[PDB]
Amino acid sequence: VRFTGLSLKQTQAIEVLKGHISLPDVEVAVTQSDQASISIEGEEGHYQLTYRKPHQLYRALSLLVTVLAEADKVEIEEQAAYEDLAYMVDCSRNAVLNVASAKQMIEILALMGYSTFELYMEDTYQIEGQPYFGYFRGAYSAEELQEIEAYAQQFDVTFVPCIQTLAHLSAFVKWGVKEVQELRDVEDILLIGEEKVYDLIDGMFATLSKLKTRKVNIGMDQAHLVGLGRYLILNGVVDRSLLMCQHLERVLDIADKYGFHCQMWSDMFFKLMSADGQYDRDVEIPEETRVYLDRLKDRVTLVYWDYYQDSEEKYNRNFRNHHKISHDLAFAGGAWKWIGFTPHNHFSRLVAIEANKACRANQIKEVIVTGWGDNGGETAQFSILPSLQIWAELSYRNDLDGLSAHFKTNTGLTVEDFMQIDLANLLPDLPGNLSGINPNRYVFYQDILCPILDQHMTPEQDKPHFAQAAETLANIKEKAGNYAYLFETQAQLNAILSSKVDVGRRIRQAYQADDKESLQQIARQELPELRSQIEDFHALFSHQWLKENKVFGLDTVDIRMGGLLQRIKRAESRIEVYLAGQLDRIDELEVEILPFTDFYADKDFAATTANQWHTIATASTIYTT
Amino acid sequence: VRFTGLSLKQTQAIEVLKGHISLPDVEVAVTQSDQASISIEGEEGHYQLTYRKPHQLYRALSLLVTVLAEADKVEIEEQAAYEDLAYMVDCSRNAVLNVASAKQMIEILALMGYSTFELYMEDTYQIEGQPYFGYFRGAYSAEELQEIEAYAQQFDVTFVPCIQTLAHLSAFVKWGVKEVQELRDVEDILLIGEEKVYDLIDGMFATLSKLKTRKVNIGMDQAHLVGLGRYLILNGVVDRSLLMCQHLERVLDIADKYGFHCQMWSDMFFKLMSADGQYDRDVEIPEETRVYLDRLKDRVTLVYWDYYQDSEEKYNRNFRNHHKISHDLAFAGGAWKWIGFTPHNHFSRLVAIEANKACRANQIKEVIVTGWGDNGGETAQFSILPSLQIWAELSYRNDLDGLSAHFKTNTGLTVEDFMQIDLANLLPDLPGNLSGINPNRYVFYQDILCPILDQHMTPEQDKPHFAQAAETLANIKEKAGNYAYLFETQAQLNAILSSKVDVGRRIRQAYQADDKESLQQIARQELPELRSQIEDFHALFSHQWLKENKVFGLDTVDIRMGGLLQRIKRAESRIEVYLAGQLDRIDELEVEILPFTDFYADKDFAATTANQWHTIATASTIYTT
Numbered sequence A, B: 001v002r003f004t005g006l007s008l009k010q011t012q013a014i015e016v017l018k019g020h021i022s023l024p025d026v027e028v029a030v031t032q033s034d035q036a037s038i039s040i041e042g043e044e045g046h047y048q049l050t051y052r053k054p055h056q057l058y059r060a061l062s063l064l065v066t067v068l069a070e071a072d073k074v075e076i077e078e079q080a081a082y083e084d085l086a087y088m089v090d091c092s093r094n095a096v097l098n099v100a101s102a103k104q105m106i107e108i109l110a111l112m113g114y115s116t117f118e119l120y121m122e123d124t125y126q127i128e129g130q131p132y133f134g135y136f137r138g139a140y141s142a143e144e145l146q147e148i149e150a151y152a153q154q155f156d157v158t159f160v161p162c163i164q165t166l167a168h169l170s171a172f173v174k175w176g177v178k179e180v181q182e183l184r185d186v187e188d189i190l191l192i193g194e195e196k197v198y199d200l201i202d203g204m205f206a207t208l209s210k211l212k213t214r215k216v217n218i219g220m221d222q223a224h225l226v227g228l229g230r231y232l233i234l235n236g237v238v239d240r241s242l243l244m245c246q247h248l249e250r251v252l253d254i255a256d257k258y259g260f261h262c263q264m265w266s267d268m269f270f271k272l273m274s275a276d277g278q279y280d281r282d283v284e285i286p287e288e289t290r291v292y293l294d295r296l297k298d299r300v301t302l303v304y305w306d307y308y309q310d311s312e313e314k315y316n317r318n319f320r321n322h323h324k325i326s327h328d329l330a331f332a333g334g335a336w337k338w339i340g341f342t343p344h345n346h347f348s349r350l351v352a353i354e355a356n357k358a359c360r361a362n363q364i365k366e367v368i369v370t371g372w373g374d375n376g377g378e379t380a381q382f383s384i385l386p387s388l389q390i391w392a393e394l395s396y397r398n399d400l401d402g403l404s405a406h407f408k409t410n411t412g413l414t415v416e417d418f419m420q421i422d423l424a425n426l427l428p429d430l431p432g433n434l435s436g437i438n439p440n441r442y443v444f445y446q447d448i449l450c451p452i453l454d455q456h457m458t459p460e461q462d463k464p465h466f467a468q469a470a471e472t473l474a475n476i477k478e479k480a481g482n483y484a485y486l487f488e489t490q491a492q493l494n495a496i497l498s499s500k501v502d503v504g505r506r507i508r509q510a511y512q513a514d515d516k517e518s519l520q521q522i523a524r525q526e527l528p529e530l531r532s533q534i535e536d537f538h539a540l541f542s543h544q545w546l547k548e549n550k551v552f553g554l555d556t557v558d559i560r561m562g563g564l565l566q567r568i569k570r571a572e573s574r575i576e577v578y579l580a581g582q583l584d585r586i587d588e589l590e591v592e593i594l595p596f597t598d599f600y601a602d603k604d605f606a607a608t609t610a611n612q613w614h615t616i617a618t619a620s621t622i623y624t625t
Ligand SMILES: CC(=O)N[C@@H]1[C@@H](O)[C@@H](O)[C@@H](CO)O[C@H]1O
Pocket: A221, A222, A265, A305, A338, A372, A374, B625
């Protein structure tokens, strides 16, 4: 590859990206031009490449590599619909992306066309004088954040931290020392009005001000009981919509002190000013709150977040609700990686297509693609690359015609192969448009003796689905190069699910039929083999985790999986005592299984959504007193 | 032994009790008399024994066996201070007392002098038409409760179910079906004013009405956020003291429909009407509430519960507070068995002495001794027998001069030997008068690599304390007869704690000193042996659990211990990886350990209180989303 017109910075960036893409032997003249986000023209090995914004050079090169495998003549012109496209990684659900993996992620985002990289850190960044904040969580040092940001800057990608300045601070506020307890209202919510809370928040911005970036998402989502705990005890009943504004104004003043411009999640305005306390509502704004908001709206960008709607109209409705408060809006979409071990790129594609229509219809300047890790971070950080390419394609081209070819240029895999990563969730009888259906997770963590999700299993279809999935994924692993770990992990999981999906039911059928030879088989052969496979899964999972994340947080998985293993040993031992005639009855097996949840009771399929480890694993108490 | 004056019922009861006590070959003439709770006179093999209330015969027999070992001549007269002395077993914290153990407990309570046996059941009794209420919890059927009660009736011991009609329903309200969710306010609290809530409660009393007893404790403690969840969203802001009264009225109306008389925990009146939301307060009663409350207080007995005070004076202050609301009061004291694996009979003794003074000074007629099982029910049900004998002696004699001798008649062990059961809690530098200090539990469940309670350990003291305790307990085990299991369990726990108390610290010390030999030894000898020892403990614990309780709830302990075991394996593997030179640092060990809590920071000792498994075991998230 011969380039003319590059700076040293750009030539060095390109050197890094040769680790992902193969530049052919051609001559490319490069310039900045406002004419297009990306333009590439020329033929017979001599090409002219222009970008509007510096970071767009890297997507241009991915396009160039792609189209030259196909043809000698190139006519590319792209007009991105969004001023900014960002990817936000969850670093608060136990999985803290390690620095080396943050660098890989940045490289890929740059090839895809993202302008912005973001980390969501509730308590997982260090604040001077707050030793419990992020303690044993692998909180990023200021230096690590600076290194990560500086790396992104190598590709003209900007960095935006997503923090919390109200709720979602559960891992911090649990620490039973006065310096932390005095900051609390209730649950995971900080105490509005308490000066020590504003000292903490000032501390958050002092840390962040060590970065170059002056753009921040301050959070403030899901503070459902705000003003109703220690706040209510100290101050009595207040208008909670005004309370939100008072808090918001204090935080904005602190941001201003450090020169930051803020975004925030939008949901609490709607929840606190709607009759049934929900996000998706047209709001009745009390006049005093309307006056307060009118002055605050000019100082903050509201982020409408929605990972769920299957149609443009549903989004547009919410955009119209938001316009009643502000026209300075951004949108946050979803790269589904928060439903256990296995992502849902398929569902992500479905909703992105529709969200992109709505966002364009409402002149949304910025889309933030979110990669949440709900309830323990058990899905791989790189599991959702197809979703990321999907949104990039939608911004730059408004279609997916180039999705797989650009994807294979950037990763070595076709997007279709990569999206087989979803397989543990893709039961055949599901419609593609319902969210959160996560058998990958609940089949895995379910008990043996007390299988409380058993009514949601359909062994005739599920067993061969999982078995075939494991074979499909082993084949993809062998051609996945450096992405192999992802597929190996999923293959082993599907192998486990193919038998575990009904082992609990088979134990009960054998018990009821008095088939003792079968119980003996299950206790002495199948369940010990099940433990061996789970330990193999745990090893693969640990390799995956340690490759992507800091070690901190893996401990919760160690605990969860060690518990599962011990519960399988209980199944073995209880069966043995019964077979030895030292029990008349196995009481666990005498209990009739009820539906776990009725959330999809009306549908013809049996699967469901169950995404809390502690209620998957047992009907007993385990965290409560 | 030969008796005259016995009914058939009494003759049958004494036959059963010969299983516990050794009646000497003497002649006893028995009659009821008003002259004393119990009197015994006579000599030379011929005795006259009177009792006031039928159940007191059985304590009288315990006393007779005791004194006849001392002497031929007998002069006994007792006047009990309390009309009723009850023991309440927690059957809601995962450990549901099996029917066989309920019968043993009743037999022992009879010999001690208790008039009343109680079971605390949040969701752990069956309600027709409510299939999720007690699901997979080992909830008692009506027939099991009837059997337990009829068995108590054999000894003229009455039965009082303790239930919940407001909060503490967490194991039920988690179930994600509409028929459960529609009953919810917030957290573990039912939705006041919802008719389906009142249908549920009617169901509760429908079940209980199948019993003979017409006395019930309806709960209503600790509903901290009542009115502030779904209640607030549906109904707006209301006077919460009035809300409580409205709910209470409804519940009492349901009780009246079935002929019940109610007791209730008193705390929410004080908490809702005090300015800081605390129990130990003389409260200003709002005017509208006083009207409502004065009516309600004539329909229910308030139970002042307090397990913590080391002085009469503090109890007296709270009695005075209560007396400004009602003179229809009972008192609840504590047999401390809710702080992990190991009871605190010693601390129970200390507070009982002072509480007994206060109850006597305030004319209290009924004392309920409570045996809570907080956060998984991991302490043995029979671990607190000394605390039970203590309260019986305080009622009947107003002193403990007879405590050890009556205890040994009743159990075969001196009370001093039995109370060694407490040892895993009895660190030598603790004063006797501070509650909740439970190294038994937190030393056990603490992580290895990330030992977040390490600052609370005092190895030079604690190590020989635990090792010596294990020997002491092994000796007592050998003379404990049918109670041996209790001491066997505790012996193995103390053996584990003597090394585990500082294994995390020694790993850190060897790591910093670069003592790779000690790291090897710890990885390859100590930690595998530790896992072996914990598996033995798990085996002993399981035998104890299955002897005393239903199998339901053991699963949570399997999970917890399974997870601990797996975390010890992680410590082994991380060290190995490091020893192999495939890591430059073990990041877990580079984190400086802070105090876990400042609760007892001002004291001379290092130990503390930490009684939530999920926060002992990890600093990561584990139940939150
Ligand atoms: C702003 C926002 O997205 N908040 C939460 C987020 O933390 C994560 O849990 C996500 C996926 O389930 O759901 C949202 O309710």
